[PDB]
Ligand binder design. Structure first.
Ligand SMILES: CC(C)CN(C[C@@H](O)[C@H](Cc1ccccc1)NC(=O)O[C@H]1CO[C@H]2OCC[C@H]21)S(=O)(=O)c1ccc(N)cc1
Lengths: 99, 99
């Protein structure tokens, strides 16, 4: 699809067996969601948001389906006011910003 | 132009007689810049992100130039660690996401 930006660019992905609505965020390096149920081990990561640096859980090799592509990706889980998919996943699906 | 996302999408904008490097950010509802003095009246706003709320000043109808287009636009000014242009300005220049 080609999406204009008058509305927030939200799409539905499948992650850890669940459908989740997520904002496509070109200013995010990483994909971050709050309070999702992902199995297995994780490591601590510190990310810097607009308000400061925040501790999150980093899950590697997570199967996601986005825009009908099935990939594996890194997913961070932690306090965020919006569940976002960042450039790590947007590049995986070949997304571009056009103008 | 068509920008892939393996890199952060950083463009220059001319504003307030300054040249600033800004992230083109589909996750930001509105542009926010840290180090800049803009003339005139403004209204206080809180914006919400990772790490909590940030207090900003909202300036309306600010002349800027980005991607070769002169427009007037809403600019938020406050202590963001990274300057971004948001969907308000991206829509004024016809930016879209494609995947
Ligand atoms: C979290 C989003 C809903 C909102 N943010 C825009 C977002 O693109 C920020 C923009 C951003 C970028 C860098 C530093 C601060 C803010 N990126 C961000 O927080 O990304 C985090 C996830 O990946 C990591 O890589 C970058 C920081 C981490 S935001 O900066 O809080 C923001 C909120 C409201 C407005 N009007 C403008 C910006």
């Amino acid at each position: 699809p080609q999406i204009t930006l008058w509305k927030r660019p939200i799409i539905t992905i499948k992650i850890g067996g669940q459908l989740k609505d997520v904002l496509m965020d070109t200013g995010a390096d990483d994909t971050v969601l709050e309070n999702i149920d992902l199995p297995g081990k994780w490591k601590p990561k510190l990310i810097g948001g607009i308000g400061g640096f925040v501790k999150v859980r980093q899950y590697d090799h997570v199967p996601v389906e986005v825009a009908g592509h099935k990939v594996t990706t890194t997913v961070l889980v932690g306090p965020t006011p919006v569940d976002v998919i960042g450039r790590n996943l947007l590049t995986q699906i070949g997304a571009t910003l056009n103008f």
